[PDB]
Amino acid sequence: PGIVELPTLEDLKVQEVKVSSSVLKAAAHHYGAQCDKPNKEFMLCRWEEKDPRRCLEEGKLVNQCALDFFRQIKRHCAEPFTEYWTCIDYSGLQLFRHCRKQQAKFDECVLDKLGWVRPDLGELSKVTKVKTDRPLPENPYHSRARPEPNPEAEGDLKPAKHGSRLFFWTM
């Protein structure tokens, strides 16, 4: 019994970034490097509040920053990125292994056109510290008041009054 509150359709009307999974995979490392702040803030909100109905604005801002990143890569390094993501898309598993020359062209293009460097191995998987300004959810699980603990057992022990007190056994 209650209300399943749901934000109206207007709040979740994001611009809906539209690139295929192969295109996303091609720009994975550079996007993670130069877009880490919105992703990290949004995910910390998601993990702390534990309520996607609450951190929708961070979901907006992450999409805004992703679209800005893709607009920059469109404006500066369109051709190498296009060839690289097409060559990634050809593979069934989308492995970076086969596509290394196009990766080199894309990397040098973004390095000398947008000042970017790909993260080294394992750099993109380190736990980061975010400087979010939202408060800490006091009751993320919405837990009710806990039952009071049972009365604690304490006190000095003396011999049982009149022994066992079990039938004729006096002692």
Binding site: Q15, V19, V23, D89
Partner: protein, 70 residues
């Protein structure tokens, strides 16, 4: 004098050839030239489903890059 044996393998080789190419070509034909994307894990399937959604024409192989976004 075993060259007479050789035709038996030859045609048989063709037989064993026919599926291996055909499947590959079929995988290229039905998926727009590119290799059939394999979903061994839920992440790959989610990527394929989002591709089907973004394509607008309900086929995952149809890919959109920079031209789709603003």
């Amino acid at each position: 004098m075993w060259f007479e044996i050789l035709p038996g393998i030859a045609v048989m080789a063709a037989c064993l050839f026919i599926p291996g190419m055909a499947t590959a070509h079929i995988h290229k034909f039905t998926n727009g030239g590119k290799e059939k994307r394999v979903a061994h894990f839920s992440y790959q399937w989610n990527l394929m489903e989002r591709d089907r959604c973004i394509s607008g024409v309900n086929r995952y192989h149809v890919t959109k890059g920079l031209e789709n976004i603003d």
